[PDB]
Write an enzyme that holds these catalytic residues in place. Sequence first.
Site, short mmCIF file in Angstrom:
data_model
loop_
_atom_site.label_atom_id
_atom_site.label_comp_id
_atom_site.label_asym_id
_atom_site.label_seq_id
_atom_site.Cartn_x
_atom_site.Cartn_y
_atom_site.Cartn_z
N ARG A 115 10.70 28.26 4.70
CA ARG A 115 9.17 27.35 3.86
C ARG A 115 8.24 28.24 4.21
NH1 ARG A 115 7.97 22.94 -0.16
NH2 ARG A 115 6.47 21.48 1.25
N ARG A 153 5.24 10.32 -15.34
CA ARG A 153 7.44 10.46 -15.80
C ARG A 153 7.66 9.05 -15.22
NH1 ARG A 153 7.71 16.46 -13.25
NH2 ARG A 153 8.00 17.52 -14.95
N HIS A 170 3.99 15.52 -2.81
CA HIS A 170 4.59 16.16 -3.99
C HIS A 170 6.30 16.29 -4.09
CE1 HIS A 170 5.25 18.64 -7.10
NE2 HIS A 170 5.50 17.86 -7.68
N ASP A 211 4.05 13.33 -11.89
CA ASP A 211 5.20 12.15 -11.17
C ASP A 211 5.27 10.86 -11.53
OD1 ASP A 211 6.97 14.47 -10.06
OD2 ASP A 211 6.13 13.73 -7.97
#
Lengths: 331, 331, 331, 331
Positions: free
Chosen positions: C105, C168, C192, C165
Site C-alpha cells: 500500500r 450507489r 472510501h 458510494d
Amino acid sequence: AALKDQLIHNLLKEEHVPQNKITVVGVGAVGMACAISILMKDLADELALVDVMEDKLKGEMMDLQHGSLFLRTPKIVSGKDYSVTANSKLVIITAGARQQEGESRLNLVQRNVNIFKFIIPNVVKYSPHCKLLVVSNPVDILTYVAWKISGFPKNRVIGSGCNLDSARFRYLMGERLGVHALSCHGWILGEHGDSSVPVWSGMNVAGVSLKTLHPELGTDADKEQWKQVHKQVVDSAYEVIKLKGYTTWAIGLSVADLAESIMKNLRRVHPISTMLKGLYGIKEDVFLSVPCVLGQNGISDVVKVTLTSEEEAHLKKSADTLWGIQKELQF
Amino acid sequence: AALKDQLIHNLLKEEHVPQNKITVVGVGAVGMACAISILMKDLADELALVDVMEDKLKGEMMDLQHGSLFLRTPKIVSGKDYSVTANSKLVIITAGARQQEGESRLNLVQRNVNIFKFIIPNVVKYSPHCKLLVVSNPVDILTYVAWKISGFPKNRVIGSGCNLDSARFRYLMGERLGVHALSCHGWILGEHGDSSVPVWSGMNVAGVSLKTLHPELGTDADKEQWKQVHKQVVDSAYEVIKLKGYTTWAIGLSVADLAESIMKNLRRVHPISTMLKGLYGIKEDVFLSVPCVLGQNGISDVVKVTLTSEEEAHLKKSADTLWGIQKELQF
Amino acid sequence: AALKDQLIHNLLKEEHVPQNKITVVGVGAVGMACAISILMKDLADELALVDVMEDKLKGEMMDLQHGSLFLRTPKIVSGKDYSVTANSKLVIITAGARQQEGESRLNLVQRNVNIFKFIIPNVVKYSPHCKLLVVSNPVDILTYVAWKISGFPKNRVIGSGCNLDSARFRYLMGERLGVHALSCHGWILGEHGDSSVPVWSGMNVAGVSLKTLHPELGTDADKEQWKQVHKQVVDSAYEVIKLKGYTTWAIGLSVADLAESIMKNLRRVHPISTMLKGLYGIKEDVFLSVPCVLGQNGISDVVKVTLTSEEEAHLKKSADTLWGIQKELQF
Amino acid sequence: AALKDQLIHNLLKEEHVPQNKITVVGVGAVGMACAISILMKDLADELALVDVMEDKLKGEMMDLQHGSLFLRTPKIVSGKDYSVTANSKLVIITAGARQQEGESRLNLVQRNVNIFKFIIPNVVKYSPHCKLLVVSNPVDILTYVAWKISGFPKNRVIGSGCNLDSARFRYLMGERLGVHALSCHGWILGEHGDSSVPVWSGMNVAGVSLKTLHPELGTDADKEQWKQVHKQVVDSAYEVIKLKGYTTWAIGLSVADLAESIMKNLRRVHPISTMLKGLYGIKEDVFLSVPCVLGQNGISDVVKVTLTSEEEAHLKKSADTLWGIQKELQF
Ligand SMILES: Nc1ncnc2c1ncn2[C@@H]1O[C@H](COP(=O)(O)O)[C@@H](O)[C@H]1O
C-alpha cells in the site's frame, strides 16, 4: 448551545462575494418576467431586485425565495437601497415613468431621464464594472441616457432594442413556412417599434435566400404580402396590450437570452441597440439596433450588414429624429 | 408559384397528435406561473390554455408564442372551447371562485362545485385518460369534488396539497441552519393551510434527527421556537398577498416539479393530497396530504409515516371537518 | 482587406480572462467522463484538459470542440504545459498510478506522491486561488498529499470520497423499495472502499427511519440482509471492471454534481473527504468522508453525525491506518 | 413481513408502458456517447441498450444505473434479446462491421447488410411504429439498407448524414470570424465524407452572404483558402482517429440534437440523409443529405436548395456511385 451548534461544526467564517450576480431594477410585470426567466436558466448565483415600492418588492422576493427548493440560485435579495446590488456583473433596467394622458412625448422622456438620474449613479456606485442592459421604453433613447449618465464606455451599455422584434418576426415566418422559428432567419434593425427596418435580403431558411426565389418579396408588387409580416410584428405588441393589458413573457425570455450570451461569454450575434456613430453615415450620438457580437465585455464587435440605399436612408431618418429629441434633454 | 412551394417539398400532411400534452385551466397569475414554469422545463410538446375570459386568454397565448424562439415547446394553443384540450396527458386546474367577504366555507366550496360541474366533464370528455392535478383552494376539498365529478379512479386525481408548504418549510429550516433547502428534510402533512401537521420526528439534515438533538423541538418548552417556523409557513401565503396582492411564482415551481415526476415517471415521493380512506383509521372519502409516490399513472403508492397519537388525532379531526362539509354539497 | 474585416467592425481590443474556468487533469476514461458531464451542465465558460499523452490529449480536445454548436461552453483548451490551466476556479485531478500485483500500500501511494509532486505545484502556480478536487485513488490519502504539497488551506482541498458510494447506495435502496434514488436517503461515511461505514440509523424515506421499523437492519440477525447492500456498494466497482474493463459514467456524474455545488455556491451537503482533525476524537492530519457543506469556498462546515460506539471506533481505526502510511511518505 | 410492506402501502398494481423510450443499438464508443448525451438531455423516460457482447453491455448498463441519482431517466435496461427494445419511439443504430484491409467497398457493405438483416427485423418486430436513425458508416448506403429491410415508409428512416460535418464546418467558420458557431451559418450536403458538397452561396453571418463580400470564396483564386476549411472538415475525422483511435463525443452530441427535434416535435431543419429520388434529376433510390424538417413523424418536408450546375453534377455523380453499389447487394 443552540441546535445549529449541536448539529453543524463550523470550519470557516468567511464573507461571501458573489461570482455571478445579476440585478433587476423594477419589479413590474416585465422585471418579474426577466427575473423568473433568469432564475430558471441558472445564470446567477445571486439575484437582486430593486424598486421604490417596498411592499411589492418584499412580496416578490419572498414568493421567489419560497421556490428555492426548485432552483439553483441560492441567494435572492431585495431592497430600496442600492447597496443590495453591489458586485453585479449585469444590471437589467426595466423601471420607467408611468404615462400620463395628455403628456407630450418629450415630456415623458424627460421624466424618465429624471428617474434614471437617481437610478444609474446608484448602480454604478455599487457595481462599477457591471454591464448595463436597458429594457425600458423608449429603449434606444433611454439606452443613450444611461450611457451619458453612467460614464461607462459604450461596449458596456446595451439596449434590448430589436432582439424581441426579430424573434417575433422569425416566429411569424415559421408559421407561414411550417418550420420552427429557430430555423428561420431574419433581421429587424434600427429603431425599436414602428420605424424598424426589415432586412429582406438577409431572410433565409437553410441558407436559401427568399428574396432570390421571390424577387418582389418586401415590395408592394408582392402578391404574398410579406411586407405585412413586418407590420404584424409592430402591431402584435399593441394587439397583446389591448388583449391582456401589457406584454411580459416574450420580453423576459428575450432578455434572458441576452443575459446568457453575456454571462457565458458566447459571442453570439444579436440585434441589439448600441451606439452607432460612424456607421452608415451616422454622425450623431445615437443608439440603434444592429447585429452585435455579445459576450462577457458587452458588445465587442458589430456586423456590417449591406443595406439598400432605401434602408440606409430609413436608418438616417431614425437617427435624426432620436437626436432631435436627445438634444432637448436636460441632464 | 407560391414561395412555400418553391422552397419546401412536402412529404406528409400528417395529423398533429401530441405525445406529451399538458393543459392548464385558468390563466390568472397562478395558471400563468404554472404555464411558464412548465414551458421552461421542456415537459410538454403541446401546451393548452383554457379560461372563460377570451381576451386575457388570447393575449397570454400570443405573448408566450412570441417567445417560441427561446423555447422547446413547439405548439401553444388556447380557447374557451375545451376541444383545444384534447389528448392531454395532464390537466392542471387553477380556476375557481374567489372567496367573498364574510362568506361561509361551505358556501365558497359550493360555488366552486358549480364551476367544476362545468369544467371537469368537459376535460374528461376530451382527455379521458389524463391525470388531474388540482391546485385551486381549498385544495383538499376541491380535489375530492373533481374526483367525484370525473368518475376517475383515485390514483389519477391529485391535489397539490402540502407540496409547497413543505418546500417553504425546508427553505426556512435552511435559513436557520445555513444550508440549502435541498439538504434540509421535513414534512408537512394533512390538511393544507392552518391545520397542517409538521412531523417533527422526521426532520433531519444528513440523516441526523433534530428532535434527538433538541428534544423540546416543536413543543412550547422549546426556547428556540421551532413551532414558530410552522406558523410562519402558514402565514407566508397571507403575508405575500398582503404585500404584492397574490402568490404565484412558488406555486408555479412546485406544480412544475410535480408535473416532472408525472411526465417522466420518476416515482419520487411528494407530500400531496390523495384519498386516504383506509389509513390512520380514516373511514370517510377524504383527501389529505401524505407522502405519495408519483409517476406516469399518478399516485401508485403511499408511504406510511409513523405518527404520534397527537398527530394521528389531528388528522382524524381534519378528516371529520372535511367530510362534514363534503356531505352537504349539492352535485 | 480580409473577409473578416469586411464583415466585422471591431469596437474593443483586449485579451480576456475567463470567469468560471474548470480544469480536468487526466484524460483517461474517468477524466473524460468528468469533462463531458461538466460540459453538458453548463458549469464553465472555459474548460481545460491536461495530461502527459499529447496525442490522446489533442484528439479528445478536437472531438469536444467539434460539438461546440451543441454546447454552451465557448472555449475548450488543452496542453501538456500547465499554463493552459491558468485562472481555474476549480481543478479536478483524475491522474494517478494503477496498483501493481504484490505491491505494498505504502509503495503505491509513494508512486502517486511522485506524480502529484509534478502536478500540484504546477496547478497552484497558475491558479493560486482555485479549489482542488481529488478523484484519484486512494482518494482519502491522495487528498492529504495534495493538501500537503499545495499548501492550500484545508477548506479548499476536497476529495470525492464517498459521494458516489452513497449515490450507489441510494440507487440500490430505491430498487428494493420501488422509489427513485432521489427519495431514498442514506449515508456512507469514512474511508472510501472496503472500510466505509454505512450509517443505518440515518436511513429513511420521507423521514421514516428504517431502523425503527426493522430493528435488526444492518445486523446479521437481519433476515432481509440489508448488510449485503453495503457489501454490494463496495463490490460494484470491481463488478463493473470485471464486466466492461473500467468505471466511468457514474463517477463523472458524481463529480459534476460536486462541481455544481461549488460553482453555484449552493451549500448542499455531500459525503466528501475533508480533513477531520478535531472530530470524533481524531488527533491526526487525516481526510475522511463526512457530510460537508460545499460552496464557492469549498468546505465551510461539517455536519456532526451521531455515531454508535462501534461506528466511532471504526473511524478511529481508519484514521490510525491512514496516518500509519502518511507518516512514512517522502515529500 | 418485509420492510418494504411495513413502510409502503401499495394502491396500484399496473404494467409499465414507457411513453418516450429510446433504444441505442451498439455499445461501442459511439453508442455510449449517444447514450450519455441522451441521458443528460432528459429526452427519454426509458433507455434501452442492445449489443451482442453481453458482458460489455451489462457493465455499461450498471455504470449508468449507478448514476441514477444524478439523472431524470428512471429506467435503463439492456440485453442481447431485442424484446428489451419494445415500444421505442426512436431507435438509434450504431452497430456495424469493422473494415478489413484490402477488402473491397462492396464487400464491406455486404457484410453490414448481413448484420442489418439480423438487427432491423428484430427492431421492427418489437417497435413497429418507431423511427430509425442510422449512424453506422457508410451512412447513406446503410440508411438505404435499413429502409429496404424494414419496409418502413421513407419519412421514418433517417441517416445522420452530414449533420456533424455541418457542425464542424460552423465551428471552423466561427474560429476564423471570432463568432460562436451558433451564429455562423453554412451547409454541407450530399454524400457524407470526402464527396460532400459545401454550399458556398448559403454561407452567412446575420444574413450577410460571405460569397457577396468575397466573390472568390470557395474557388482556387481564393487567397484566403476557404476551400481548405471544407477539406479540414473531411480530414478532421481521420485526424481524431489517428490521435485517440476513434471519434465519439461530437457524434453523440450531434445525434442527441436530432433526437431532440424528433422527441419534442420541433420541426427544425437539419442536414440529414433522406431518400432523394425525384430531386435534382436523380432517378435512383438513393439517400443523400439535404436540409430536412424533422419532427415526431421523422422527415415531413425537404428544403429545395438552389444549386449551381457544378454542385448539381457533383450530387448526380455521388448518386450514380451509390446506386452502382446498391444494385449489387444481396438482401
Ligand atoms: N390584509 C392582509 N393581507 C394579508 N395578510 C394579512 C392581512 N392582515 C393580516 N394578515 C396576516 O396573515 C396571517 C393569517 O394566516 P393565513 O390566512 O393562513 O395567511 C396572519 O399572520 C395575519 O397577521
